[PDB]
Amino acid sequence: LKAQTKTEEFDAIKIALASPDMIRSWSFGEVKKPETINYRTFKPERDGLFCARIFGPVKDYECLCGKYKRLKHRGVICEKCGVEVTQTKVRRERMGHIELASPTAHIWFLKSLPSRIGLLLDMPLRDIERVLYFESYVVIEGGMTNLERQQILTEEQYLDALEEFGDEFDAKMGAEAIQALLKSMDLEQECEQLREELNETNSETKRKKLTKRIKLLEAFVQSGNKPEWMILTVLPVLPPDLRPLVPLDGGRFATSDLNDLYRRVINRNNRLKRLLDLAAPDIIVRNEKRMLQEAVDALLDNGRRGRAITGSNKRPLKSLADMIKGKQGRFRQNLLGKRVDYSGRSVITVGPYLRLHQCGLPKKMALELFKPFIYGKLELRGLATTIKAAKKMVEREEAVVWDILDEVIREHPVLLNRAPTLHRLGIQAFEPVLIEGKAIQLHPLVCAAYNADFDGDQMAVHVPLTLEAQLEARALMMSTNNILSPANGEPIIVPSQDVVLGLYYMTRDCVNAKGEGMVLTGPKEAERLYRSGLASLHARVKVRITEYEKDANGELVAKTSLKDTTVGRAILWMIVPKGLPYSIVNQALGKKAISKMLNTCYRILGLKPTVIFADQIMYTGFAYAARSGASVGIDDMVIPEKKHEIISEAEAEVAEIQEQFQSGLVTAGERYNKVIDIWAAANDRVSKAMMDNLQTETVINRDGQEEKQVSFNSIYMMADSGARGSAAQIRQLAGMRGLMAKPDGSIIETPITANFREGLNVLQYFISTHGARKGLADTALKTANSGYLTRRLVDVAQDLVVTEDDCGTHEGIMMTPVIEGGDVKEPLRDRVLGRVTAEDVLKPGTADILVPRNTLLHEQWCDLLEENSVDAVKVRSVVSCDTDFGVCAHCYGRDLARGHIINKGEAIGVIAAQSIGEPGTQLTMTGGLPRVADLFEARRPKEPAILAEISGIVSFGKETKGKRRLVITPVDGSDPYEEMIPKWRQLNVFEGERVERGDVISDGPEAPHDILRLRGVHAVTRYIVNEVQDVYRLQGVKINDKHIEVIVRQMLRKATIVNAGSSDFLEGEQVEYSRVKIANRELEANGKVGATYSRDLLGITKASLATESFISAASFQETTRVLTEAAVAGKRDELRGLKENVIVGRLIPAGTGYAYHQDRMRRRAAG
Amino acid sequence: TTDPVRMYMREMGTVELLTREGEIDIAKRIEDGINQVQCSVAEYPEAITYLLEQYDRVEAEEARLSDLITGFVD
Amino acid sequence: ARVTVQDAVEKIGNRFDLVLVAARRARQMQVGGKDPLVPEENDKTTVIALREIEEGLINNQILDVRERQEQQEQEAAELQAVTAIAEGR
Amino acid sequence: HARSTGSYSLVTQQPLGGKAQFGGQRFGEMEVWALEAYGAAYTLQEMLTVKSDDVNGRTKMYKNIVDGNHQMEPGMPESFNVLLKEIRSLGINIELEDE
Ligand SMILES: [Mg+2]
Ligand SMILES: [Mg+2]
Ligand SMILES: [Zn+2]
Ligand SMILES: [Zn+2]
């Protein structure tokens, strides 16, 4: 079968050096003149940087001279001025060239940090520049005389050396010499020479540097690149329209800086050509060559020499390297990142009437957005003769068009996005609802997921054009399909504030209210009692209710009873669907209980019932909250009656300790701390006074004498329900507020004795100011810290995607409760939930299999384990998964916005990174958000501890040489380990005991590198998760351990070989490649041997550095170095990743695209 | 030191300035050099006959007086 | 409207292959080639395909089968036309 | 603000408001990740190719929208197509191999 020739849809890409002849292939002509445009008629002058002959017609399908103006003539080359009449687009495509008189060095291969030309010739850089500037002569192919091949001579020395040997020895200077060296260089012969020398001399110092060079050389040999190409003979010119001269208003012109650069290179070059035919003296032509060299360098990458400046403007002219480069890496994909059609934006508002699956869309916005759809539908039914008439119709805004828009709008989701996109819920699909007005209406329950307040925040709209985008939006990005945070299984659609204050006020009970004690047939007639004004919303009442339990086999049982409840709870039951028990609504319904309600509803009835449920809860919450007439008055804030007394008593203590300091009974420092303690205790005292008074002090009467219940006072209801406010903020309102801190951080010893209900005087406010300003500053900075963290995180993971189904390994980690210092900082049920068992678990007794091998542990299975006493469960994790180049779905977990096991092809790395990064705003400024960054960066602490390197009996040897050696002695194994540890660090380790490998030989923090090396992979991964989870959990952030585990796996992605027989002995390399390779030896070729590796720990920012795709690396790294370092080796990028596929603009090899790429990947390496 | 401005000033600074007498010395050699080639051209038979064939083209209206001689010494 | 795709995800497990399959079917309907297998409520082809998945009358097997059937149904018409290409001889 | 099809920047073909029908909303890296967490491949391709950067694909699409055919014939975004010429403008030969 025949291959191909013309443009098919390409896969992969290759990059390499460009031959001079190869450069001529692209060039359709030589730019011979610095001239640009004619200066009167603005047409391009032939042949110049802008040329119709070389590049293309100025206007579409029209010859320059004007002889052939007809659209029919196409492949015709005009006889006057050869211009093939073709679309002006080809002026954006066709390249050109320039033939340089003298050779020229390519600055990228000269000045890249490991100078490429330098170490290829094994010659220093400073010398090479000295040869390019004609400051000395260099030898080439010395023959048998006096001289080294690469030796450098001076003027006098070259002459003296020349008198002895005239011929059979040759030396040059300048660019031609370096080019001659590279051409004369035989890489193959040099390779052989380097092979012998490795074996001959044995020294680490020697063969270390040695091995670096030989791999590089042979790589360049295997590459196919020939060394000469690092010196430019021919120079390609960029198409004119990519650096346009295009006119502006007022008749002035503007053009790209490249022109100023290109023009210069031409002039100087041309001048040199002239200077050859005039036989100028050496000193001049030398100076001209140097001038040409500087110009080419400035053109390619400016700033590596003098930083040449553009004409009349101080600011340095932007060169070709700076067009690619930027902040950061490339401008193309970096923030930000390209403008997009079919979009819009405006201020957003509430719209509580909306169902959770829809959103209010302004009329005008929808008109301008769907403009093409409106045109096409208008002429599909025949209301408009042709597309033009449709344009005039919508431009006239005729009344008939509004009905047509409802058709194109109906089933057609729109994407809503907010400004700081963090996790995937930052964009969600909704069904549009036409709304008069210029504001966007957004379902309240989603306002939590977007973290969108109403203080004037704006949101953006995107239209899903292609059919696949409609079904992607509807089945993935739809609002109703993500109700649960991917970070933790708790619902993120949880009612927020106003709604929950309603339900709290709804199901609550006072002591005496209208209708107390009566009985009703059912919830229906309960509402009939309330709405008519007979019964109070909260009164204790028995009513017949019908609850449900599905406890049969997939089948709903029904049960009825007389429940003791209130009127509000009775009415609310009408909403609760089917199989939920009445126990869930019988409580006071705070914000905490109201979330677990929604959660249970999802895990029992499924998705669909939960959605419609959630809507009803919101609607009823707002409604009843409005009925409640909740408000806040100045008399709603009750100050304790005992406050003034508490302040006075605490005021005596300070004068007591003060009396002790004047008489010297106590030191100055002890005094400060002392006063601060008594004042602090006072604050707690006042706080827990107003708390008692505020909470229960409503004391009311039912028929009998007195009694007291939880207060119905407004502000209290807010704090108790979970709607808004908390004991801390309230403490500032009624009781005294805190002890502020002076900028230096020393909490002031005279607290703020007043509060907001009273007035603050001059001083108290002035002292309060620092706390506010430092608060705002810290957050504004912590905003940046969070973003940077997510960046590094998603960079190190990204391309990680669920690929196989089950890798089939029994391996996994042991999950126990966190049990931190007191009692259970986190239970067992949360740690194992939604994960998969590593092996079958026993009861406390045995021959009883509870969970059969690998099974998803859902709510029932975790409760069945909890019924029994089971204290420990082994769980498959993403760090242990045997699948190479990905994660098996069985090792990950179920977690998603859906409860089902994770689908094949979902990209978990990104959602993992987003879940870890988003909460980082709430962390502190050891501990805090920077503490997390240190953990993921593997950074070694300042004064670390040391662990026993190997098991066996240890002892102390020699003496204090600034280090006192520690010698470990295994029983059977070899002794030789003796480490020199400075002894001025307090020891721990018992001098006379045998230590298991990895025990504590001293105190202080430990480097996570150790834990991996000595204790092992599972040990170190447990260390990271438990420590990082401590930081977040202390602040109340719920992040499932899964995400942290996937980040960890990428940290250890690389390993260092130990044994040999196929590979590079000491090379650090991917454990993915190795494991498939050592499997390729266990039964393949030669056993050989081999190879044993050692897992390595790379910090997040360091591990992301290594990426197979060079197009990916060129994005976030330093562009120049990446391109060079890849271009020499001829590396062939196969795509296969996410980052690279986004750049080139095709389907992501994940999710919906995963079917496509998979099917194509197999087509490759086949026939 | 890179900065090609520097490597020029230093490359030319080696050449030593001419004395007022030295100018004529070099200039005399030029005259000698050219006069050598002028006489060498005068010694070629084809150089004469060619000039003849060229002047016959001038008189034949195949050329102009400006395209052959710039004027004579006398 | 179709509020939750949960039912379709049960019929085809992946939930991504659901988007693909429903897409392929939705184009068979959108570009005027076939008709719905179930009452259209005025729902656009996006949602009509999903109902067909929920009701279990459309999936990847049937479509490949159905398409493979149409291949032979058109190959039957052109049967005489293409055998007339004996001009190869 | 709202825009369907507006003007375009010359240097890189991208939506730009010249009439005060303002250029479209800027779709970012963080927003790209948001699409990557969901399984939506086609939305992302259409976002950075036909809806913005593809000087061909945009017109081939628009004609299909009025015709009643929802599809995309994506092609290569002009941003990346320029990056190829800038690299090739240097001494670097960058080719698209195979098939
Ligand atoms: Mg809010
Ligand atoms: Mg705001
Ligand atoms: Zn012409
Ligand atoms: Zn696995």
Side-chain angles (χ1 to χ4, degrees), chain A residues 1-326 328-331 336-337 339-924 926-1058 1060-1080 1085 1087 1090-1167, chain B, chain C residues 1-88, chain D:
Chain A
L1 220 158
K2 181 255 183 173
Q4 217 74 283
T5 38
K6 285 298 135 298
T7 296
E8 295 272 68
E9 199 46 78
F10 72 102
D11 45 39
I13 266 167
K14 197 164 65 66
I15 193 181
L17 267 302
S19 145
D21 295 317
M22 179 57 125
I23 287 180
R24 291 192 191 101
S25 311
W26 313 331
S27 180
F28 284 134
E30 174 160 18
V31 177
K32 300 175 180 178
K33 291 207 295 180
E35 281 78 338
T36 52
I37 55 181
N38 162 274
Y39 116 104
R40 181 43 255 155
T41 65
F42 295 131
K43 318 190 168 198
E45 215 89 63
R46 60 176 294 163
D47 306 31
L49 293 80
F50 301 80
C51 178
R53 176 212 155 213
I54 306 179
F55 308 100
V58 192
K59 215 174 75 174
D60 273 344
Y61 276 95
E62 203 176 339
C63 170
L64 185 270
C65 75
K67 180 178 173 183
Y68 301 68
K69 300 191 182 64
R70 185 51 194 150
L71 315 182
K72 128 79 208 164
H73 309 336
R74 49 190 200 211
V76 43
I77 40 134
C78 178
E79 297 91 26
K80 262 71 176 184
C81 50
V83 181
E84 55 166 274
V85 0
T86 314
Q87 339 175 187
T88 210
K89 272 199 177 294
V90 284
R91 234 169 159 266
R92 146 184 299 268
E93 298 179 347
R94 309 204 191 279
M95 305 206 64
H97 73 317
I98 296 174
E99 218 91 20
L100 301 159
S102 177
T104 309
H106 196 303
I107 184 172
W108 269 16
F109 303 93
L110 192 70
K111 285 300 302 304
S112 75
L113 184 274
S115 171
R116 296 294 147 177
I117 309 177
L119 43 68
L120 181 63
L121 296 165
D122 193 75
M123 184 176 177
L125 188 272
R126 197 57 216 167
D127 276 17
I128 292 190
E129 281 203 303
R130 189 209 271 274
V131 170
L132 273 186
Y133 294 139
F134 308 91
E135 294 268 330
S136 284
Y137 273 96
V138 69
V139 183
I140 54 171
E141 281 281 332
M144 314 172 79
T145 56
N146 208 10
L147 308 97
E148 306 273 40
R149 176 174 182 267
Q150 304 251 353
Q151 185 150 49
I152 80 183
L153 306 171
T154 197
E155 274 213 346
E156 302 231 312
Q157 285 158 359
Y158 181 32
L159 179 56
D160 183 44
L162 227 177
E163 276 188 329
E164 194 168 21
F165 329 90
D167 287 332
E168 88 235 318
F169 149 84
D170 197 11
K172 307 284 213 308
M173 78 190 320
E176 311 182 3
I178 291 299
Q179 197 212 348
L181 264 169
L182 289 158
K183 183 137 56 182
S184 64
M185 160 163 293
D186 196 328
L187 310 144
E188 314 156 349
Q189 314 290 76
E190 286 215 36
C191 291
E192 309 174 27
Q193 294 188 185
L194 289 183
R195 296 178 194 284
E196 294 176 77
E197 294 183 354
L198 190 286
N199 216 30
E200 307 317 310
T201 65
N202 317 317
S203 315
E204 275 305 323
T205 57
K206 293 184 167 59
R207 87 190 88 81
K208 182 257 290 294
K209 285 176 49 185
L210 174 56
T211 191
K212 188 160 53 62
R213 179 157 200 276
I214 182 53
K215 255 287 181 289
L216 162 68
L217 277 157
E218 69 181 31
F220 192 87
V221 173
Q222 185 179 328
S223 148
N225 284 334
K226 256 205 176 268
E228 312 92 68
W229 291 327
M230 305 210 194
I231 296 304
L232 289 176
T233 310
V234 194
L235 205 169
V237 322
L238 187 79
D241 277 319
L242 302 182
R243 40 165 181 85
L245 236 179
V246 294
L248 260 306
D249 322 279
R252 196 211 301 267
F253 277 68
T255 181
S256 183
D257 298 24
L258 303 175
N259 297 309
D260 187 304
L261 283 172
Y262 262 108
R263 196 156 39 94
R264 182 171 307 154
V265 169
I266 300 180
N267 270 323
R268 300 186 180 183
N269 184 46
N270 273 328
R271 188 194 293 139
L272 207 159
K273 297 217 278 186
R274 248 159 72 212
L275 282 172
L276 292 192
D277 282 30
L278 271 66
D282 279 340
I283 295 89
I284 294 187
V285 312
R286 288 199 184 143
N287 189 34
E288 190 65 26
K289 285 183 179 183
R290 273 192 298 266
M291 285 168 52
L292 172 100
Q293 180 74 44
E294 186 196 48
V296 174
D297 288 342
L299 186 268
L300 308 180
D301 191 333
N302 196 20
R304 289 157 182 267
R305 324 276 245 182
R307 317 245 313 161
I309 64 178
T310 183
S312 196
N313 169 237
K314 165 194 177 180
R315 179 172 281 95
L317 27 62
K318 180 171 174 184
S319 60
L320 295 169
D322 304 326
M323 297 201 162
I324 298 182
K325 211 172 152 58
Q328 207 171 28
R330 268 150 203 173
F331 289 152
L336 215 282
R339 303 193 110 171
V340 174
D341 288 322
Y342 307 92
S343 63
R345 60 164 175 173
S346 89
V347 185
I348 64 176
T349 175
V350 196
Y353 58 91
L354 293 164
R355 301 261 286 278
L356 172 77
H357 65 74
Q358 50 193 26
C359 73
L361 213 161
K363 270 194 173 189
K364 307 188 175 189
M365 290 196 52
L367 195 274
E368 184 60 48
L369 275 158
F370 292 89
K371 232 183 195 300
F373 297 94
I374 295 181
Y375 289 163
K377 207 68 148 57
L378 264 182
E379 73 169 57
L380 177 56
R381 323 178 76 80
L383 279 73
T385 321
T386 185
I387 162 128
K388 253 267 182 175
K391 170 194 290 185
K392 251 173 291 186
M393 288 185 63
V394 320
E395 197 173 353
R396 201 184 326 275
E397 285 184 55
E398 291 184 4
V400 210
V401 310
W402 298 114
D403 302 11
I404 308 296
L405 196 155
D406 276 319
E407 292 187 46
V408 297
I409 259 320
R410 245 178 66 88
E411 303 289 61
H412 190 139
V414 296
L415 265 43
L416 262 72
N417 179 43
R418 208 201 106 107
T421 312
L422 266 310
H423 55 259
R424 69 195 223 175
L425 288 164
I427 310 185
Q428 276 176 284
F430 291 89
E431 211 157 76
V433 171
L434 270 303
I435 289 299
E436 301 263 351
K438 305 213 177 183
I440 297 182
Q441 312 211 295
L442 169 67
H443 194 273
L445 290 181
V446 189
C447 258
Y450 283 134
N451 192 17
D453 291 314
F454 281 151
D455 43 271
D457 308 90
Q458 304 182 190
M459 288 193 67
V461 293
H462 291 254
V463 176
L465 311 181
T466 178
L467 228 48
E468 283 89 336
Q470 318 213 76
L471 284 168
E472 273 175 351
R474 184 172 290 279
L476 304 159
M477 319 182 49
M478 192 78 208
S479 169
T480 63
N481 290 335
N482 319 317
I483 66 277
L484 305 179
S485 176
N488 56 314
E490 296 181 12
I492 200 66
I493 308 300
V494 45
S496 304
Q497 38 191 56
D498 284 48
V499 38
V500 326
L501 182 68
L503 268 89
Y504 173 90
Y505 190 90
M506 246 211 351
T507 145
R508 170 66 183 275
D509 59 324
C510 47
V511 68
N512 180 22
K514 296 211 230 179
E516 161 134 355
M518 78 175 302
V519 291
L520 301 88
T521 175
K524 300 179 181 178
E525 91 162 35
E527 179 182 47
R528 171 147 31 88
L529 252 287
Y530 174 60
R531 292 290 284 133
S532 51
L534 291 182
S536 169
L537 192 44
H538 23 51
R540 317 115 136 196
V541 161
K542 290 198 177 190
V543 292
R544 175 188 302 165
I545 65 103
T546 306
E547 57 180 84
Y548 292 97
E549 200 162 21
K550 66 168 306 178
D551 216 17
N553 51 274
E555 194 58 81
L556 303 159
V557 190
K559 133 177 182 182
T560 290
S561 127
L562 260 73
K563 282 284 190 304
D564 218 314
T565 183
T566 90
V567 187
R569 332 195 166 165
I571 302 175
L572 171 58
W573 172 255
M574 300 202 59
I575 293 170
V576 185
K578 295 309 177 181
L580 265 65
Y582 191 87
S583 61
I584 203 66
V585 298
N586 223 339
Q587 34 179 143
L589 262 298
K591 192 219 173 186
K592 260 307 167 188
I594 204 180
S595 181
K596 85 182 174 178
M597 175 170 300
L598 267 174
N599 178 73
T600 53
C601 178
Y602 183 79
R603 275 84 166 94
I604 299 171
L605 272 74
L607 181 65
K608 313 136 286 294
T610 314
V611 181
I612 190 169
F613 188 19
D615 264 325
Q616 296 294 291
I617 302 170
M618 188 197 64
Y619 299 125
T620 187
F622 284 151
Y624 274 107
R627 301 276 316 287
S628 79
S631 179
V632 54
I634 221 280
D635 291 328
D636 273 274
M637 298 160 295
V638 177
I639 340 283
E641 71 153 69
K642 287 300 179 180
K643 181 193 177 186
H644 191 36
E645 201 165 295
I646 299 179
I647 302 179
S648 282
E649 304 174 11
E651 223 159 51
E653 242 79 17
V654 313
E656 286 244 53
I657 310 305
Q658 181 71 291
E659 258 182 31
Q660 288 187 320
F661 176 70
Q662 297 163 15
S663 297
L665 271 67
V666 288
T667 63
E670 208 163 21
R671 178 273 214 191
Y672 171 83
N673 248 71
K674 196 70 176 64
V675 187
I676 237 175
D677 274 30
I678 79 207
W679 271 123
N683 186 12
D684 295 328
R685 290 186 60 191
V686 191
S687 179
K688 297 314 168 187
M690 76 130 291
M691 243 329 195
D692 299 343
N693 196 332
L694 210 307
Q695 151 203 178
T696 198
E697 207 77 321
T698 44
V699 281
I700 0 78
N701 28 24
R702 173 50 202 169
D703 91 81
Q705 355 283 337
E706 283 182 16
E707 194 169 356
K708 64 181 77 185
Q709 63 192 172
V710 267
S711 182
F712 263 50
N713 150 262
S714 308
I715 186 181
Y716 185 80
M717 295 187 299
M718 293 194 255
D720 193 286
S721 61
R724 207 148 182 84
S726 68
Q729 303 170 328
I730 308 302
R731 174 182 312 150
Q732 297 216 50
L733 246 40
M736 68 176 65
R737 54 156 307 184
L739 324 80
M740 313 308 298
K742 50 208 316 202
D744 172 30
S746 39
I747 153 178
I748 308 180
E749 60 184 77
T750 319
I752 312 293
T753 45
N755 57 73
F756 294 117
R757 216 261 196 173
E758 328 168 357
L760 281 84
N761 79 326
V762 207
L763 300 324
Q764 296 165 308
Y765 212 104
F766 191 97
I767 300 177
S768 172
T769 288
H770 165 62
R773 190 173 292 189
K774 189 194 176 186
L776 301 188
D778 281 23
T779 58
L781 179 131
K782 290 272 177 285
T783 287
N785 271 314
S786 179
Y788 190 82
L789 186 60
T790 73
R791 226 210 169 278
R792 287 185 286 177
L793 262 54
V794 59
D795 282 328
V796 86
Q798 201 127 43
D799 308 333
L800 190 91
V801 187
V802 168
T803 159
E804 207 166 319
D805 206 21
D806 177 38
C807 63
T809 186
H810 313 249
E811 208 65 91
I813 68 181
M814 207 60 197
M815 272 286 164
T816 78
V818 317
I819 48 114
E820 159 56 44
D823 251 344
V824 62
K825 249 181 172 304
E826 190 87 36
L828 181 63
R829 188 178 175 275
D830 293 321
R831 295 263 294 173
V832 194
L833 174 73
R835 306 204 68 159
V836 61
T837 14
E839 52 196 59
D840 342 40
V841 78
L842 33 280
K843 294 218 222 281
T846 348
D848 323 308
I849 300 185
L850 293 165
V851 311
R853 253 308 248 88
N854 53 17
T855 51
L856 180 59
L857 307 192
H858 47 77
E859 287 66 39
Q860 268 96 56
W861 278 114
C862 298
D863 280 315
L864 182 148
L865 285 184
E866 186 191 323
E867 290 225 342
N868 308 36
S869 275
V870 53
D871 215 27
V873 174
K874 211 194 248 296
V875 172
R876 315 183 57 175
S877 175
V878 288
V879 60
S880 59
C881 176
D882 194 44
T883 288
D884 311 322
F885 299 152
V887 170
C888 71
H890 276 15
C891 269
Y892 181 86
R894 71 171 196 173
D895 197 350
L896 216 46
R898 44 179 291 184
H900 267 101
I901 203 262
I902 187 64
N903 317 92
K904 226 169 182 173
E906 194 129 22
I908 50 185
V910 172
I911 95 158
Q914 293 185 340
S915 304
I916 302 183
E918 184 258 6
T921 298
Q922 312 166 206
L923 297 179
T924 329
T926 90
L929 181 66
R931 166 67 190 177
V932 181
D934 281 23
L935 280 172
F936 285 137
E937 218 58 270
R939 290 205 215 91
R940 176 188 181 275
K942 276 160 53 61
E943 211 174 5
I946 12 107
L947 302 317
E949 278 310 307
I950 187 58
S951 193
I953 175 68
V954 89
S955 35
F956 293 75
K958 208 191 68 78
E959 272 315 306
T960 305
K961 221 211 126 182
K963 291 126 183 60
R964 190 248 312 269
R965 307 156 104 181
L966 198 61
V967 191
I968 337 175
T969 302
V971 185
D972 52 40
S974 197
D975 57 24
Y977 223 109
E978 45 159 284
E979 193 175 313
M980 316 211 175
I981 295 179
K983 48 163 290 185
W984 284 277
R985 287 77 221 163
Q986 186 178 44
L987 300 321
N988 197 240
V989 54
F990 325 103
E991 87 95 21
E993 231 79 25
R994 184 213 73 99
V995 285
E996 255 287 311
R997 31 179 284 108
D999 267 320
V1000 278
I1001 313 303
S1002 64
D1003 289 324
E1006 59 267 62
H1009 313 276
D1010 309 327
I1011 304 298
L1012 167 274
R1013 207 167 41 84
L1014 267 295
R1015 235 166 291 184
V1017 178
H1018 286 246
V1020 58
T1021 183
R1022 174 150 34 84
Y1023 167 61
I1024 274 69
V1025 302
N1026 279 113
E1027 212 63 88
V1028 63
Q1029 272 281 51
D1030 280 335
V1031 183
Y1032 281 84
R1033 174 169 34 83
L1034 193 57
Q1035 287 290 0
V1037 170
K1038 287 280 187 174
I1039 293 184
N1040 192 288
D1041 315 276
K1042 262 188 288 287
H1043 308 308
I1044 307 174
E1045 291 169 14
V1046 1
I1047 283 292
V1048 167
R1049 176 188 155 150
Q1050 300 302 81
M1051 293 202 307
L1052 56 85
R1053 158 166 52 186
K1054 287 259 171 186
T1056 50
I1057 326 181
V1058 173
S1062 190
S1063 220
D1064 313 28
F1065 209 60
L1066 41 47
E1067 196 175 358
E1069 194 44 46
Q1070 309 274 300
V1071 73
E1072 272 69 44
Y1073 271 106
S1074 299
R1075 285 157 142 261
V1076 319
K1077 269 134 179 177
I1078 68 138
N1080 193 93
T1092 71
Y1093 44 69
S1094 180
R1095 273 282 169 84
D1096 274 87
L1097 214 176
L1098 261 58
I1100 47 163
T1101 208
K1102 179 64 189 309
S1104 55
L1105 171 61
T1107 307
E1108 305 265 330
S1109 167
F1110 70 84
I1111 302 176
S1112 179
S1115 302
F1116 49 84
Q1117 300 178 31
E1118 178 218 328
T1119 301
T1120 317
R1121 191 209 271 176
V1122 169
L1123 268 304
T1124 340
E1125 218 156 299
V1128 283
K1131 189 183 296 183
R1132 187 169 171 269
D1133 189 340
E1134 224 113 23
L1135 295 168
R1136 293 160 47 180
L1138 273 63
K1139 217 59 172 179
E1140 45 271 54
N1141 279 261
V1142 161
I1143 292 294
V1144 81
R1146 59 173 49 161
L1147 282 186
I1148 305 180
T1152 307
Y1154 186 84
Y1156 167 80
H1157 263 77
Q1158 191 66 11
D1159 201 39
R1160 207 185 204 188
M1161 197 68 179
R1162 176 191 65 259
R1163 193 179 296 196
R1164 191 178 252 159
Chain B
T1 168
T2 64
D3 79 309
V5 24
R6 204 54 62 196
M7 358 195 67
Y8 177 78
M9 223 66 152
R10 191 164 50 235
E11 192 157 308
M12 60 84 52
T14 72
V15 180
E16 296 173 324
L17 282 171
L18 269 187
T19 60
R20 314 178 315 278
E21 48 156 34
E23 306 175 356
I24 281 78
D25 278 277
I26 296 172
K28 178 65 68 176
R29 299 170 60 185
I30 301 176
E31 271 194 324
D32 292 24
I34 43 109
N35 212 300
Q36 291 192 47
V37 322
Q38 286 176 129
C39 294
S40 299
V41 169
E43 302 163 18
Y44 197 28
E46 287 284 64
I48 317 293
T49 61
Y50 174 81
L51 184 51
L52 287 188
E53 295 173 64
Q54 287 285 290
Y55 189 68
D56 298 338
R57 275 188 45 202
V58 168
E59 297 269 305
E61 240 51 80
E62 299 165 52
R64 193 154 91 92
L65 278 168
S66 308
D67 300 83
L68 199 49
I69 56 180
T70 321
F72 327 96
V73 189
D74 276 315
Chain C
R2 171 95 312 265
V3 48
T4 92
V5 302
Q6 186 52 73
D7 317 83
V9 186
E10 293 289 324
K11 298 318 291 171
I12 6 179
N14 194 352
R15 169 206 235 197
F16 298 150
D17 277 79
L18 165 62
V19 184
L20 235 55
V21 168
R24 183 187 192 181
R25 173 62 189 180
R27 288 244 247 280
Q28 276 189 346
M29 293 177 301
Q30 187 169 79
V31 176
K34 298 182 194 335
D35 52 38
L37 260 53
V38 118
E40 44 175 321
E41 308 300 301
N42 297 335
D43 302 336
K44 294 192 182 66
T45 73
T46 285
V47 188
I48 299 186
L50 289 179
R51 289 161 62 106
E52 296 184 47
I53 307 292
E54 283 183 343
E55 303 282 354
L57 354 73
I58 284 294
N59 59 18
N60 217 312
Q61 174 81 235
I62 281 81
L63 296 171
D64 279 333
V65 166
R66 189 58 148 81
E67 194 181 70
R68 280 188 303 125
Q69 174 175 325
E70 293 192 54
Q71 295 175 302
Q72 294 153 9
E73 300 228 8
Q74 302 180 339
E75 200 180 352
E78 286 187 291
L79 200 58
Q80 273 154 309
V82 64
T83 36
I85 312 309
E87 179 59 83
Chain D
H1 298 66
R3 170 232 184 89
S4 51
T5 325
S7 332
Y8 292 105
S9 170
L10 180 197
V11 44
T12 53
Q13 307 268 32
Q14 287 195 18
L16 164 69
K19 277 308 173 62
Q21 137 218 61
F22 231 65
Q25 201 65 27
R26 224 164 271 196
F27 200 90
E29 201 179 13
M30 295 170 293
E31 286 74 34
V32 163
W33 299 339
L35 293 199
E36 275 170 334
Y38 301 145
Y42 286 112
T43 297
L44 184 131
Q45 186 179 44
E46 88 157 19
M47 201 68 54
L48 56 86
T49 300
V50 146
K51 287 207 276 179
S52 180
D53 224 335
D54 203 272
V55 68
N56 237 76
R58 57 160 79 115
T59 47
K60 309 298 179 179
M61 169 59 116
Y62 193 88
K63 296 180 174 178
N64 282 25
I65 301 287
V66 305
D67 259 48
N69 176 26
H70 302 14
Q71 286 211 74
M72 40 174 298
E73 197 171 54
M76 177 170 56
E78 197 72 18
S79 65
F80 177 74
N81 186 66
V82 162
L83 178 73
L84 237 79
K85 300 297 184 300
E86 291 184 333
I87 292 180
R88 237 195 267 249
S89 68
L90 310 186
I92 313 293
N93 170 38
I94 185 171
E95 291 180 320
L96 316 95
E97 293 247 299
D98 241 28
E99 102 290 307

